[PDB]
Amino acid sequence: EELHLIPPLNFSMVDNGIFRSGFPDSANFSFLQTLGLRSIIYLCPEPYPESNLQFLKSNGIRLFQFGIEGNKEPFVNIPDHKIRMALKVLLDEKNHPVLIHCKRGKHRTGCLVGCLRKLQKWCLTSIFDEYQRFAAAKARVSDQRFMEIFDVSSFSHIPMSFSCSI
């Protein structure tokens, strides 16, 4: 086959040991195996399909599910607590390498990554630009507003010695 690896929908590296994507399917499993994942942070409330559960079991991957309802704008309401819990998992380097995913890798995943960038002291315009690159024509002002007002205070003490940015 030679060119045989298929990263999942909207796949990207976020930082050392942190990846983002939409929902993996079996065509993506050989690529995800190469990343030596310890963790998935899964941001949809739907049960993980059997195919994906077998992949986690076979590969020794822990599933962290913080289900955020997949509403359309303007009827979206990202719960602060779920993002807060997900950031706590993301900030524990023992969980790396970790893949964050939702359905499309644009909205729920975009919000969690944007809140991480706020902890990494990125200016809002740089955070929004990265969010928009993935969300493309489906960029939601509400997701960027969520990142704008998300309170980082509780996380200030946590060292991020894992990051490429020190």
Author numbering: 49 to 214
Manuscript excerpt for this entry:
Here, we provide the ligand/enzyme crystal complexes for one such PTP outlier: Arabidopsis thaliana Plant and Fungi Atypical Dual Specificity Phosphatase 1 (AtPFA-DSP1), herein unveiled as a regioselective and efficient phosphatase towards inositol pyrophosphate (PP-InsP) signaling molecules. Although the WPD loop is missing its canonical tripeptide motif, this structural element contributes to catalysis by assisting PP-InsP delivery into the catalytic pocket, for a choreographed exchange with phosphate reaction product. Subsequently, an intramolecular proton donation by PP-InsP substrate is posited to substitute functionally for the absent aspartate/glutamate general-acid. Additionally, we conclude that the hydrolyzed phosphate remains trapped as an enzyme-product complex, until it can be released in a prisoner exchange with another PP-InsP molecule; the latter process is assisted by the WPD loop.
The oxygen atom that is positioned at the apex of the phosphate ion’s tetrahedral geometry points away from α4. This oxygen makes a hydrogen bond with the unprotonated Nδ1 of His155 (we will return to this point below). We denote this orientation of Pi as pose A, i.e., Pi(A). The three other oxygen atoms of this Pi are intensively coordinated by amide groups of P-loop residues Lys151, Arg152 Lys154, His155, and Arg156. The side chains of Arg156 and Cys150/Ser150 also make polar contacts with Pi(A). Deriving such crystals for AtPFA-DSP1 was initially problematic; we were unable to displace enzyme-associated Pi by soaking crystals of wild type enzyme with 5-InsP7. This observation also speaks to how tightly the enzyme holds on to the Pi product (and see below).
